[PDB]
Design a protein around this ligand. Structure first.
Ligand SMILES: [Zn+2]
Lengths: 34, 27, 58, 112, 77
RNA sequence: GAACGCGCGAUACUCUUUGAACGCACAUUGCGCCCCUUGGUAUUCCAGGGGGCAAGCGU
RNA sequence: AUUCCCACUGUCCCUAUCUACUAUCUAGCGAGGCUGUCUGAUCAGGCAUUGCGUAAGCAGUAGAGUAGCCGUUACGAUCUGCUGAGA
RNA sequence: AUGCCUGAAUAGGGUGAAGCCAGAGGAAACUCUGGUGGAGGCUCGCGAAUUUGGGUAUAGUAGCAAAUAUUCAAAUGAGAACUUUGAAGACUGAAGUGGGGAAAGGUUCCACGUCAACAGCAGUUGGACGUGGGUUAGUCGAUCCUAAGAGAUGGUUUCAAAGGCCUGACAGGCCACCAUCGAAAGGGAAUCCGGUUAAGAUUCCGGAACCUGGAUAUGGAUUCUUCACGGUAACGUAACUGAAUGUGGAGACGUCGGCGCGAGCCCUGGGAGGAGUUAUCUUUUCUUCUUAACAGCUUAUCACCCCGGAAUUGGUUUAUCCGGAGAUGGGGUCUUAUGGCUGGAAGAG
């Protein structure tokens, strides 16, 4: 059970990192648009 | 095989790495 | 059927590969319980940022 | 089930010497050294393989005709078609913009 | 080696100044219909190549043999 | 002084390859250039032989 | 790492036997069955550091099953008899 | 201890990470189930360690020299356990006790004669002794080039007068930048098959073929007289001038995984031969049935071009990637890697 937990919080960290980098990419492309 | 033939003296004293002779000092 | 590369590696490189694996395992086991072996990221996390350091000094 | 080896001085598995096995008219398996394959010429702007140009070794080009290593279009044998089209369009638009800038400048110092 | 399908080209090859000998080779071989036949190869070497003419017709081979120069050496098989 | 050969050096009981060693390299009998000449179809090619190559914004 | 429970053991009571190797001298010199595998298959054998009591053959209408018809070809493990036989 | 340049090697078994597909629960986030996918400080056979070649930096006693299995007949010879032939038994078992190479060795290769010494018994044997024979290249290497680095010139291009070329019925002009060494595993123009000796082979012989350099001749083209055409296009061609100057490609470049294709080997059916076994059974067990470099015709995934304008979103890989920055669809262009037919070539084997 503890292993499955630590796995799901690892998934949480990975998804948050990917979402953050995607949002940053969109934000930095917005400036280059104009 | 640290030494080879020396042209000036004919001995097996020509150091291949140093390119110098330990018997007649060539060149 | 065994491949040629497998035969060559097992005839040539297996012994020293196994020995190095054993040595690495032994060293890791020995330094697992020692105190003072940390990664650079962990050292930075323990150190904290600048603002955390003025907070600690206060 | 007959074993063959190199036929030249190099005894090592280097890219220079590579071996194929063929059955000779004598009924035996023998080794044959294979040369390096040729590389298609590439466009000088985008790096894609040029179309309609023969793929040969560097010294084998001197023994074929010009139609086997060129294309009848301008820059043929050096640049592909899309790169040439882009060059033409860009040059024309640059010249037109130069004309427009010169006219605007002639207007703006025409005030004094 | 080169193959030629032209009879007059072969005759022109055999008519040059530097011609040594012509070889006539016979092969007993079967065709796709299954009936065996006689195939004749006329070989002459030019400057740097050996030109071969393959004829699967008996009468044409006989006519070409009769049309060869009388001062030309011919190897039978 | 050394190497290879028949005391001597292809003229071998004139002086090969070298060596302070000298066209350049060199643990290779490797790579050049210049002048004359000869031969093989020959103005072009190829080869052999001989002999060589360590000016000024000054007065 | 230590201590108790059960089971086993030549550790021991208490030694004994076999195989291999070794040691010695001489010539010269000289400080019946089973597993795996192979002989084309049976039969009969080889190898795997002993690898770990009913013969071969024939017959039966008895015989798991394979293979012919809607009383019936053939093959056939196993079993029974020749057979306390064979060696 | 830390390096640098150029090569070889970085294998296998197991497990199964992101991502993706189809389902179920939930308003999302998400969480389970099956598959797919094939990743790692995953496993298996301040410290230590971290494959490898070449180059290059900072008493007749101890004992028998230890690698198992030998036996029978014949030959030679003065002499045979040790030499030779045949038969039997046994061994290496493609990761060899089998065939080659770099380095290194230098005649140890082959033949004839011999056993004084040597091969720790013997020997008629020999990697021994004595005498001879043997190594053949335009295509294989070196030779050429540069790598790390080394090293002249006045420390490696530096307050150096450092060199070549061009024009013109001696003057003018152009350009910049340093020798050389350093790899028989890096880059590189080109040869294959068959046969042949006591000992030589991609080198010799026979046949067949390519590469580079050079001088030249002929045909054809260069179409009114002067450097050619076709297709919308990708592009095609028997040609189809091109100085200074400025560029581009090949050479020329990390490692791993699955998928597709070709070739060699392995497996296998029929048939044409030869060999073995057969008291009984066994259409049975073994072996031959091959096609070189080179050359002509033809043959492509990818990529690109033209038409066209797509949501009811389609196409599509084992791997979820692609499309108004133009998909699906229809029709074309190209590289010839690699197959097929043919010549070489059946005359060979
Ligand atoms: Zn391009």
């Amino acid at each position: 059970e503890q292993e499955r937990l630590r796995k799901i919080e690892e998934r949480q960290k990975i998804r948050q990192e990917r979402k953050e980098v995607m949002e940053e990419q969109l934000k930095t492309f917005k400036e280059s648009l104009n | 095989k640290s030494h080879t033939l020396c042209n000036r003296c004919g001995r097996r004293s020509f150091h291949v790495q140093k390119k110098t002779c330990s018997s007649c000092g060539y060149p | 059927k065994v491949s040629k590369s497998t035969k060559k590696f097992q005839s040539k490189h297996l012994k020293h590969t196994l020995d190095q694996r054993r040595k690495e395992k032994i060293q890791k086991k020995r330094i697992q319980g020692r105190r003072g072996n940390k990664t650079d990221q962990e050292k930075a996390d323990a150190a904290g940022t600048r603002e955390q350091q003025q907070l600690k000094k206060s | 089930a007959q074993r063959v080896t190199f036929r030249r001085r190099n005894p090592y598995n280097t890219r220079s010497n590579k071996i194929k096995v063929v059955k000779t008219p004598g009924g035996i398996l023998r080794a044959q050294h294979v040369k390096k394959l040729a590389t298609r010429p590439k466009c000088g702007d985008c790096g894609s393989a040029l179309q309609g140009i023969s793929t040969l070794r560097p010294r084998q080009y001197a023994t074929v005709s010009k139609t086997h290593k060129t294309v009848s279009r301008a820059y043929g044998g050096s640049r592909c078609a899309n790169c040439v089209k882009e060059r033409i369009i860009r040059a024309f638009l640059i010249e037109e913009q130069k004309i427009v800038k010169k006219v605007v400048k002639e207007q703006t110092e025409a005030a004094k | 080696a080169r193959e030629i399908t032209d009879i007059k080209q072969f005759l022109e090859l055999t008519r040059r100044a530097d011609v040594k000998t012509a070889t006539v080779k016979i092969n007993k071989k079967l065709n796709k219909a299954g009936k065996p036949f006689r195939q004749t190869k006329f070989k002459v070497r030019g400057s740097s190549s050996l030109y071969t003419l393959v004829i699967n017709d008996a009468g044409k081979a006989k006519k070409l043999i009769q049309s060869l120069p009388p001062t030309l050496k011919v190897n039978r098989l």
